[PDB]
Amino acid sequence: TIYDFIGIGIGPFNLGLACLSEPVEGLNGVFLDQNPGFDWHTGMMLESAHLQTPFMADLVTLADPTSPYSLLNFMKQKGKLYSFYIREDFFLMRKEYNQYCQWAAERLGNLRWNTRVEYVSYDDNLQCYRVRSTDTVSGKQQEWLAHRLVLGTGPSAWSPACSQPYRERFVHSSEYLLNKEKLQKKRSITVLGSGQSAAEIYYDLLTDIDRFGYQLNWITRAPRFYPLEYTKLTLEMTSPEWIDYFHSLPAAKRDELNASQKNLYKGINSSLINAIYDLLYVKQLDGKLDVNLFTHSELTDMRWLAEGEFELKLHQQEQDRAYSRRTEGLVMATGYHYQPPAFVEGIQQRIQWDEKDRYDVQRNYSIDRHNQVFVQNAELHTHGFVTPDLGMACYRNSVLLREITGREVYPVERQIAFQTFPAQSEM
Amino acid sequence: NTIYDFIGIGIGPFNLGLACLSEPVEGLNGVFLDQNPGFDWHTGMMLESAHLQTPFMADLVTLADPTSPYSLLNFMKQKGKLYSFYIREDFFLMRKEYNQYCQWAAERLGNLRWNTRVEYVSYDDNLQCYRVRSTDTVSGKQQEWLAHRLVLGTGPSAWSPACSQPYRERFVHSSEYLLNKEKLQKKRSITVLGSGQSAAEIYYDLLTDIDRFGYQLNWITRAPRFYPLEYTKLTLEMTSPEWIDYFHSLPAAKRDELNASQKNLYKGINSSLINAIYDLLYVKQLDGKLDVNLFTHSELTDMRWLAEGEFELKLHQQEQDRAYSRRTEGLVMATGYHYQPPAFVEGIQQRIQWDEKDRYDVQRNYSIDRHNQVFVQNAELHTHGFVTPDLGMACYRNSVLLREITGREVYPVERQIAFQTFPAQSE
Amino acid sequence: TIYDFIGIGIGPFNLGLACLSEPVEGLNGVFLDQNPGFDWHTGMMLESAHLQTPFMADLVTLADPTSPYSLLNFMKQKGKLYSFYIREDFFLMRKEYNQYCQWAAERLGNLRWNTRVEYVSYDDNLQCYRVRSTDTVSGKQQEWLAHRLVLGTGPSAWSPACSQPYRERFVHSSEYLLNKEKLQKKRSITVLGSGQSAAEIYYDLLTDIDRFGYQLNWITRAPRFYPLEYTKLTLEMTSPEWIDYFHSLPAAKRDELNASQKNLYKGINSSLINAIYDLLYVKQLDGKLDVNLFTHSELTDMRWLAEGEFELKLHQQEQDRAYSRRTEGLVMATGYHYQPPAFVEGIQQRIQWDEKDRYDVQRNYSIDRHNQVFVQNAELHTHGFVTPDLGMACYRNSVLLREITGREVYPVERQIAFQTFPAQSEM
Amino acid sequence: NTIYDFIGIGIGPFNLGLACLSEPVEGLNGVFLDQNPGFDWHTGMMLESAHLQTPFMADLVTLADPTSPYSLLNFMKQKGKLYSFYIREDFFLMRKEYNQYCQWAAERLGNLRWNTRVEYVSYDDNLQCYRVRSTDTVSGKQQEWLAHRLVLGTGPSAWSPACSQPYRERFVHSSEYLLNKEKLQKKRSITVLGSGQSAAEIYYDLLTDIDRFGYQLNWITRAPRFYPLEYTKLTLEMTSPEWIDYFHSLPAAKRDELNASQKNLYKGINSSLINAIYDLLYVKQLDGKLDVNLFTHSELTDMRWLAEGEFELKLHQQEQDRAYSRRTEGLVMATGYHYQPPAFVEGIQQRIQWDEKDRYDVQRNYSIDRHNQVFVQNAELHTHGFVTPDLGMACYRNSVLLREITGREVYPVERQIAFQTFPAQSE
Numbered sequence A, C: 001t002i003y004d005f006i007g008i009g010i011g012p013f014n015l016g017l018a019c020l021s022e023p024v025e026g027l028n029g030v031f032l033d034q035n036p037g038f039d040w041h042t043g044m045m046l047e048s049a050h051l052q053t054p055f056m057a058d059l060v061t062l063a064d065p066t067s068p069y070s071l072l073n074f075m076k077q078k079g080k081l082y083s084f085y086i087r088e089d090f091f092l093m094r095k096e097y098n099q100y101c102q103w104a105a106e107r108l109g110n111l112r113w114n115t116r117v118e119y120v121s122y123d124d125n126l127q128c129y130r131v132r133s134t135d136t137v138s139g140k141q142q143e144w145l146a147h148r149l150v151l152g153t154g155p156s157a158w159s160p161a162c163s164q165p166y167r168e169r170f171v172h173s174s175e176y177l178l179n180k181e182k183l184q185k186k187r188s189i190t191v192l193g194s195g196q197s198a199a200e201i202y203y204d205l206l207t208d209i210d211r212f213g214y215q216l217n218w219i220t221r222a223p224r225f226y227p228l229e230y231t232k233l234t235l236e237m238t239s240p241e242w243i244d245y246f247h248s249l250p251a252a253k254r255d256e257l258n259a260s261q262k263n264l265y266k267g268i269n270s271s272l273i274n275a276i277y278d279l280l281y282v283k284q285l286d287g288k289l290d291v292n293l294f295t296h297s298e299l300t301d302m303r304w305l306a307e308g309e310f311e312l313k314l315h316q317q318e319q320d321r322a323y324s325r326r327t328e329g330l331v332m333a334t335g336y337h338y339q340p341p342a343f344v345e346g347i348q349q350r351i352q353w354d355e356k357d358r359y360d361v362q363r364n365y366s367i368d369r370h371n372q373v374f375v376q377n378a379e380l381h382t383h384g385f386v387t388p389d390l391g392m393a394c395y396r397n398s399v400l401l402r403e404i405t406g407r408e409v410y411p412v413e414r415q416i417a418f419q420t421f422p423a424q425s426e427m
Numbered sequence B, D: 001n002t003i004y005d006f007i008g009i010g011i012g013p014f015n016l017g018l019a020c021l022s023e024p025v026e027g028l029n030g031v032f033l034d035q036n037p038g039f040d041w042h043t044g045m046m047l048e049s050a051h052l053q054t055p056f057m058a059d060l061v062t063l064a065d066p067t068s069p070y071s072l073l074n075f076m077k078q079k080g081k082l083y084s085f086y087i088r089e090d091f092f093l094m095r096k097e098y099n100q101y102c103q104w105a106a107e108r109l110g111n112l113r114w115n116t117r118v119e120y121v122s123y124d125d126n127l128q129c130y131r132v133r134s135t136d137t138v139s140g141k142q143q144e145w146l147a148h149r150l151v152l153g154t155g156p157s158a159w160s161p162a163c164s165q166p167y168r169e170r171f172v173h174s175s176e177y178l179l180n181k182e183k184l185q186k187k188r189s190i191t192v193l194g195s196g197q198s199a200a201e202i203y204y205d206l207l208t209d210i211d212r213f214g215y216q217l218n219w220i221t222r223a224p225r226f227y228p229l230e231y232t233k234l235t236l237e238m239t240s241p242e243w244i245d246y247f248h249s250l251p252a253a254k255r256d257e258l259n260a261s262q263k264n265l266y267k268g269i270n271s272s273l274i275n276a277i278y279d280l281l282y283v284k285q286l287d288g289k290l291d292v293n294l295f296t297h298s299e300l301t302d303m304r305w306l307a308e309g310e311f312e313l314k315l316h317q318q319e320q321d322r323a324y325s326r327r328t329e330g331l332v333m334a335t336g337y338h339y340q341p342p343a344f345v346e347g348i349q350q351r352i353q354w355d356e357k358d359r360y361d362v363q364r365n366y367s368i369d370r371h372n373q374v375f376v377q378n379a380e381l382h383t384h385g386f387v388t389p390d391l392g393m394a395c396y397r398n399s400v401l402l403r404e405i406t407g408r409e410v411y412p413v414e415r416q417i418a419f420q421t422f423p424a425q426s427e
């Protein structure tokens, strides 16, 4: 009836945690999630889309390579590992990541699907957390009791403030695939934003720009179509060492950095930029292309015209000028935002909050005052750019398991980098 | 005393693998013997820069069982450095690290007996099992081991063309290179004979220092071209169970005019290195003509050591059907390795099937005997082709060995890999 | 009225020769061709197809980088060189090569289109060649007199002997693009052969294998889907040095080699093999693919069935078995064959012939007995695998111009390779 | 005597370019003066392995005129080696070859005067032209040159932080490195200060030999990361006339908080090298912990030379706002180059427009004067941005210089390049 911990969302981070926590003698854990199964970014799962991270950043390998949930074992189980060996590609197709997480989810015993947690509270008598769910299929109430909670509810698709009207006219990157036909039949399309999502889509639509007749535009507030910096000395910043350093900085300094370091976690894989460019070059060989590409351009307002068009007021923040552009179809590749879910109100008072009323996460990813309520991927403001990285999932899950059980279930490296991040006098 | 299910004689990579795959198999009682005091693998051609030509998934166990604790990835984890390796992002291990990894695996195993020279092996009719006579090399103690089955991975040995036996005191085989590098760099002139990978790693190493010491640096080989090892992915399907079960459709040794015909599938230099070699000649040449020669299609038929203080190499340019001669003080004979049955095998001579040439006439499941109990690792260049020296096909073979030794599939064996169909097949 | 030389075809080789010969003081040359303009392999000109050779193997640069016909100048003239610089890709799209040769052809003054030469003779009185043309548009006869002739009439699309019936049912690689729609609407397609043409098409059709419903088969007589060997030490074989060596071999030995060295000039760009494999892997993620891929399989016969199908009798030459396969659509990527054109009869007697009744080409590409009748790309049997290489076009054109004018108009390197090809004794 | 249309003072690459582009222009009478006895370009940071970060098309002339005989490709042809370079297939020239190429261009030009130190420059009111006073360095002879216009490409000079002036006798700037390599490798400890490309080429060079000599090898820089130079193709559009004519929309020096903000577009290390550096640390570490440190975000504020026999470096970790100190025997100060106006320019001080800081307030066509007749090469880091030190934008500038010097477009100037639109623009 009582669990050592209850894990509240089931995305890749909690799924990881589940695969890691299943084999631990003396640990009862359970993971709730409101959907019927694992399905991860179904709407940006393009046929030629792959992860930004090598396959060793699967569910378990960075913490335990021997785990049967490893992507390589997965491959062995489907009798295709030898083909994966021949492929010799560190980067899984997103479709395969998904098929693999699904496999892991079927195999696990600790997951409870179709279970929407509606409310969470602290019972002062019992000294434990009380989690109220609703079966999404049947209505049934349940309560789940646990000493510790970990939240990986995920963040949520975000569109600019000035577009909550018109929402039914545009498509947010996340829904791109469902609406891809509806878009290609328009005569002009525009993608708004410069993240990897934005780029994969822009590439997708370019592939067919002379199959259909469209104009393909790309506008963003970002100064450049920048690459995710992936050179090996910078990849050391993704390390326990660096997280310590970053966590220990002043809280303004962190937020300051997180907006200044967007090229460490938000940019476009550099092969794709180049592929896009090479494709514009190839397409141009037939005749001039109807493409427009703008930079430094914030969407300040939009409006819907009579004939069946948008008019996008933008503002060029570097040369301080405003301007107007129009487009039949629109793809809002503006990314995602966390917001503490509804249920958190019930424990809301027991969670520590910072000046901006966000979780005041501690180095061990705890938000309560007693190391029982943890978060996954709500720490961008407090642990830095490494927070959403599937390749630091095992590391977090390992510091979690160390807090939840008393002990270092999975060894957690203290430093792996050749460089030294903070100031350190010699002697 | 007790009769082992199998004994493995020789702890090369192939038996070291079979050891790690054997260890945790329930009711398998087997043991591995080797002379050497621990694991080492050709420490005298192992240059700072060298590395394996296969991805790291062709480690001791992973292509049969990714969950094994003897996996490379796990070694890396246990050593404290998997994040660094994740940053490295390189399918190819440095030969020195493969070496440390194997040593760590061997130190962790329990089924290996080091310092155990095998002197003689016989079949004990009266007991109906094999009798293996060993010397403990550190005590001197003789000892006898009983086994129903033997798996021999003794490994091949350093080889030079017949015509060179008299000068073996002076020329240095590739295995002896690092130990004489300093010696050879003092000569006026060095020549590197043979155009496999060993030769090229060396030729590159020496070219590096050519502007710095005297020398003339020559490269001569019998081969037609300095050909690359064919690494295109359609062709690696031929290193697969399907292609090996295809190769088991008897041309009864017209598979042997195939084995010299399919030269560039298992011999041949790494593409990168060939190009590296070229780019280096280019860079050195920016300072002057390079005293280099590079010949090709040339069999070394005779050799002599002039009173002058130089070799004279008699070469036969085989395509032009024309003979020539060249000279050289230093001489690195990069002509490979060849398998001869060890001493201890006279003891079961009459028990072993022989090929018309006194090669083990290896059966399809790797047995040399009549009753499926004496097996061999990589003495089948003639029976299984270009694929017998590949660390990638190690787990496949060890898996079929354990099906035979055990009677049951222990590690499944992926036959659903190749897109190609290899045999004729009708519709 | 009289020309120093008349150039009979206008493909890339004679077009090159034309750009090179135009600026030479004291040289009157003229190039006839029966089509209305330059259009080069229109039917294999896929959108993502590019040359196998870097852009410095354009019309002129390997002989004169300062020529205004250089691909880079071309780029400058269209005001897009800075974009070509950003692209940083040595390999022109085939579409761009074409647009560029067309540009060069407009610019030239020495080309005569719509002129089919029907007959050629030696006038014994005049001591010169007499070339009879027909204007393809208007019927008009003309005669052109020249001292020397050079023939770059091109080779011709070839299909296996056993298919001259059925010719109207299949598509030869050369016509692929016109018939691409007609093929994609079939339910099964097969490509016959393993050259670069075969591969580009197989890739093309795979891109859409789940857009349409087809089965995509690939069958070839070749042992493997082999790569064109492009490693830099082998690329030295494409050199004056090597051609000397090769030309000087016995004529059986050459033919022998030309069939043994098909991987030097006939194979698939290795990126494409791998791309094809990666695409089979990606496509397979959705469900098993209806693809079949056969090797060592000669098409011995074919026949057309009632319902609307082919039945291809093949013969697996390695395991000596015949078999039968069927396919609605068929793409015959069997390449091309030279045959001396009709007009050569008129000079036929003055040309030297070899044992097999092919031009007995001399080192300077002459076929007459007096160094006045030259060929371009009819020397495979006598100059080797480098014959069709656009990157040796400038070299040939340069030895031609040296013979035609008295003198070395464009310097012709005697050796550029670090290695030495023939036997060469030291002293 | 005669008054030149322009005189160029300093024969760096930029004026060497303008020389080659100027030479064949009809009715342009101009000449170039330099002290040095011939061309050399920083011979003491030029390591066997170094190479340019730009493709070879950014040679002296090709981006303005591919037909020029001063093109690299033509140099390669004239030297007898273009086939080798075609085999090399490498957009990036070795720094030693760029050097030989420029020297060959300069030896072939007629408009350069070497050994011609320019002592003083004045405006002769009475003649209405500029007066340039020179010393012939080999005769001693004073001499005076007249010119309507001056183009100054004197080049910047080696720079160290202010706080180091006292120890300049002991530490070695990157320019002096090869000459003290042997000296520095004898020390216990070496430190490399600065994280541009120079630093990295050096840091790599030294790491190479780290296992071989004593040393501790440190790397410290002010920069936040060891960032790569941004080479993604969408971003190289910003190095283009369009982006430079965009940059000519006055923020009147808010383009100066851009110039430190756009650090990684023109400073920053080659991607490959960063990774190379990492892979080498990895390989060396296979033998032991490496005595290396690498610090970042650290301004060198003070420095001192202890009696002990060591420097003590006072560093300020700027992000952590914390001071520290480190020590080192050897010290390579890889801190770059800075432009100060030369001596001879006092002579036209009142004639030159100055930026509020005594920098030439460079006008849009590169003029420093009021009457469009004194021009400058690469003293505009503030007026034209990240693009002023790029050999790729050399031909662009020399082309606009020759429009001004000449009144007519001599070499067109490609403004139809970028797919991006850079300024705001409405629809």
Ligand SMILES: Cc1cc2nc3c(=O)[nH]c(=O)nc-3n(C[C@H](O)[C@H](O)[C@H](O)COP(=O)(O)OP(=O)(O)OC[C@H]3O[C@@H](n4cnc5c(N)ncnc54)[C@H](O)[C@@H]3O)c2cc1C
Pocket: A008, A009, A010, A011, A012, A013, A014, A032, A033, A034, A035, A040, A041, A044, A050, A051, A052, A053, A115, A116, A117, A118, A152, A153, A154, A155, A197, A336, A341, A343, A376, A377, A388, A389, A390, A391
């Ligand atoms: C499109 C995209 C692609 C990415 N690709 C990469 C990559 O290649 N490499 C990399 O390192 N990082 C990547 N990231 C970063 C990261 O994976 C995601 O931002 C995101 O965090 C997905 O993981 P998650 O576990 O946090 O959340 P989710 O996948 O959102 O998991 C949360 C789940 O819980 C559910 N839920 C919410 N509330 C409740 C409730 N009360 N009860 C029950 N269930 C609930 C949700 O609907 C969902 O099923 C990517 C991100 C996105 C958005």
Ligand SMILES: Cc1cc2nc3c(=O)[nH]c(=O)nc-3n(C[C@H](O)[C@H](O)[C@H](O)COP(=O)(O)OP(=O)(O)OC[C@H]3O[C@@H](n4cnc5c(N)ncnc54)[C@H](O)[C@@H]3O)c2cc1C
Pocket: B009, B010, B011, B012, B013, B014, B015, B033, B034, B035, B036, B040, B041, B042, B045, B051, B052, B053, B054, B116, B117, B118, B119, B153, B154, B155, B156, B337, B342, B344, B377, B378, B389, B390, B391, B392
């Ligand atoms: C240097 C080298 C590098 C290679 N790299 C690659 C690669 O990157 N990729 C690839 O696919 N293939 C590679 N190969 C091919 C293949 O790995 C080898 O040729 C060899 O077959 C592998 O070793 P083994 O297990 O057969 O035995 P070995 O490595 O030769 O070792 C076997 C042991 O047998 C012992 N022994 C002999 N007699 C006795 C006795 N009487 N008693 C006890 N012990 C005895 C020896 O002391 C030795 O330790 C490589 C081969 C070599 C030689």
Ligand SMILES: Cc1cc2nc3c(=O)[nH]c(=O)nc-3n(C[C@H](O)[C@H](O)[C@H](O)COP(=O)(O)OP(=O)(O)OC[C@H]3O[C@@H](n4cnc5c(N)ncnc54)[C@H](O)[C@@H]3O)c2cc1C
Pocket: C008, C009, C010, C011, C012, C013, C014, C032, C033, C034, C035, C040, C041, C044, C050, C051, C052, C053, C115, C116, C117, C118, C152, C153, C154, C155, C197, C336, C341, C343, C376, C377, C388, C389, C390, C391
């Ligand atoms: C599809 C294809 C792709 C290739 N790609 C590459 C590559 O990327 N790189 C490379 O190095 N090599 C390549 N090659 C090799 C080579 O370019 C071709 O095989 C072929 O030789 C084209 O050049 P050509 O000048 O010989 O002939 P063609 O292009 O055939 O030129 C001959 C012309 O003369 C005409 N003609 C014939 N008879 C007469 C007559 N009596 N009167 C007037 N005109 C006549 C023809 O119809 C034609 O216009 C390729 C070859 C093919 C077939």
Ligand SMILES: Cc1cc2nc3c(=O)[nH]c(=O)nc-3n(C[C@H](O)[C@H](O)[C@H](O)COP(=O)(O)OP(=O)(O)OC[C@H]3O[C@@H](n4cnc5c(N)ncnc54)[C@H](O)[C@@H]3O)c2cc1C
Pocket: D009, D010, D011, D012, D013, D014, D015, D033, D034, D035, D036, D040, D041, D042, D045, D051, D052, D053, D054, D116, D117, D118, D119, D153, D154, D155, D156, D337, D342, D344, D377, D378, D389, D390, D391, D392
């Ligand atoms: C080492 C180095 C490598 C670089 N590599 C690249 C690269 O790969 N890609 C890229 O895009 N950018 C590169 N740059 C950036 C740029 O090329 C340089 O910083 C510099 O501006 C180029 O030289 P310059 O033509 O300005 O003059 P310099 O190279 O400095 O030479 C100019 C000459 O001025 C002479 N001089 C000075 N005073 C007098 C006088 N009174 N009389 C006569 N002569 C005088 C000097 O003797 C010298 O010969 C590099 C820069 C340096 C310094």
Ligand SMILES: NC(=O)c1ccc[n+]([C@@H]2O[C@H](COP(=O)([O-])OP(=O)(O)OC[C@H]3O[C@@H](n4cnc5c(N)ncnc54)[C@H](OP(=O)(O)O)[C@@H]3O)[C@@H](O)[C@H]2O)c1
Pocket: A044, A049, A050, A051, A052, A094, A160, A173, A192, A193, A194, A195, A196, A197, A198, A200, A219, A220, A221, A222, A262, A265, A266, A267, A297, A298, A299, A300, A333, A334, A335, A336, A388
């Ligand atoms: N591996 C994969 O296959 C994959 C695929 C998709 C996504 N992802 C990941 O998911 C996360 C988010 O990716 P994403 O592309 O969805 O989102 P993102 O990187 O947050 O995209 C935000 C983009 O939208 C722009 N934007 C926001 N508001 C705007 C406005 N008003 N006007 C104009 N532009 C505006 C942003 O500019 P600013 O930069 O100024 O905000 C930025 O360029 C990252 O962790 C990323 O790596 C990964």
Ligand SMILES: NC(=O)c1ccc[n+]([C@@H]2O[C@H](COP(=O)([O-])OP(=O)(O)OC[C@H]3O[C@@H](n4cnc5c(N)ncnc54)[C@H](OP(=O)(O)O)[C@@H]3O)[C@@H](O)[C@H]2O)c1
Pocket: C044, C049, C050, C051, C052, C094, C160, C173, C192, C193, C194, C195, C196, C197, C198, C200, C219, C220, C221, C222, C262, C265, C266, C267, C297, C298, C299, C300, C333, C334, C335, C336, C388
């Ligand atoms: N750069 C480019 O974009 C490009 C594109 C297309 C072509 N090309 C060039 O054009 C030339 C020819 O190219 P290609 O692909 O058109 O022709 P090719 O290389 O001559 O193709 C012949 C292929 O067809 C097979 N074949 C012939 N007869 C057969 C039979 N009866 N049964 C089964 N298979 C049979 C051949 O096998 P065998 O090997 O046993 O003969 C071979 O695999 C080359 O110089 C090539 O590089 C270049």
